[PDB]
Amino acid sequence: SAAGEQHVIQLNQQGGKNLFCFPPISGFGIYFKDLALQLNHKAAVYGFHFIEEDSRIEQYVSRITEIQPEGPYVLLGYSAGGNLAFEVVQAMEQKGLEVSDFIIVDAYKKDQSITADAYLPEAVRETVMQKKRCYQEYWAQLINEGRIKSNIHFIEAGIQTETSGAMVLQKWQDAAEEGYAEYTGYGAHKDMLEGEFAEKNANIILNILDKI
């Protein structure tokens, strides 16, 4: 890393399975705080940030194996983080590492590149927003290709008021070499891992972990 810092926060106690979590477009691992609270002393939740450097994938693999030197590994991605994590899974597998299970919380397989999407002095505002801007640019250009060996667990939103026929085609069935499962979770997309819904969606995640 740029300054020897890390790009992940351990958000609850160690124990059970390690769950390596990749963030939504806001870009910071603290996003997973509510999930971590719900899984405290059940699974160890590590919340990654979006790494701005082009070597990000290698760095994620390096950090995961530092934390947990022996597989198999379990990864999770929420929203944009599902698309990012899929790339990390592929990288890990290409190195011969075993990713047993990949939990995708309301992310949709990204098949084409697209165009990218206060209380602060403008100079601070720009620095503070840099990670999210970088992530927006990375996500816009990103294309998830092919399959992973890892079992896929797709957890969709429980409230869905604007589903396209196009989105239903991008629920990751074509991305599984082996195991695929789909689950209806709780809440609208933006709310799933926060507030009241974190508890209900965490139960799904734990049930998945418990069945491995």
Q: What backbone phi and psi angles, to 5 degrees, belong to 43?
A: -145, 150
Distance in angstroms (rounded) separating the CA atoms of residues 11 and 150: 24
For the chain, which domains are there? 1-110+147-210 (3.40.50.1820), 111-146 (6.10.300.10)
Residue with tokens 């597989």, as numbered in its chain: 71
Residue 143: C-alpha distances to residues 116, 132, 169, 212 (Å): 13, 18, 15, 29
Q: How far apart are CA 200 and CA 206, in angstroms?
A: 10
Closest CA to 144 of 179, 101, 108, 198: 108
| Separation between Cα atoms, residue 182 and residue 162, nearest integer Å | 19
Contact 23, 81 (CB under 8 A): yes
Three-class DSSP labels, the chain: CCCCCCCEEECCCCCCCEEEEECCCCCCHHHHHHHHHHCCCCCEEEEECCCCCCCHHHHHHHHHHHHCCCCCEEEEEECHHHHHHHHHHHHHHHCCCCEEEEEEECCCCCCCCCCCCCCCCHHHHHHHCHHHHHHHHHHHHCCCCCCECCEEEEEECCECCCCCHHHHCCCCHHHECCCEEEEECCCEHHHCCCHHHHHHHHHHHHHHHHCC
Tokens found for residue 10: 């351990």
Q: What resolution in angstroms does the PDB record give?
A: 1.8
**Burial status of residue 67 (CB atoms within 10 A of its CB: 0-12, 13-18, 19 or more):** middle
Please say whether the dihedral angle defined by the alpha carbons of residues 59, 61, 62 and 66, taken in this order, is positive or negative. positive
Token couple for 52:
């701005």
Q: Are the CB atoms for 190 and 106 separated by under 8 Å?
A: no
Tokens at 132, concatenated = 């999210």
Q: Of 149, 150, 161, 148, which Cα lies nearest the Cα of 190?
A: 161
Q: Are 171 and 182 in contact (CB under 8 A)?
A: yes
Q: Which two tokens stand for residue 126?
A: 């720009």
Residues in the chain: 212
Residue 4: count of CB within 10 angstroms of its CB = 5
Task: Give Cα 5 distance to the centre of its chain.
Answer: 21
- CA 204/CA 129 separation, integer angstroms: 33
Q: Is the Cβ–Cβ distance between 24 and 78 less than 8 Å?
A: yes
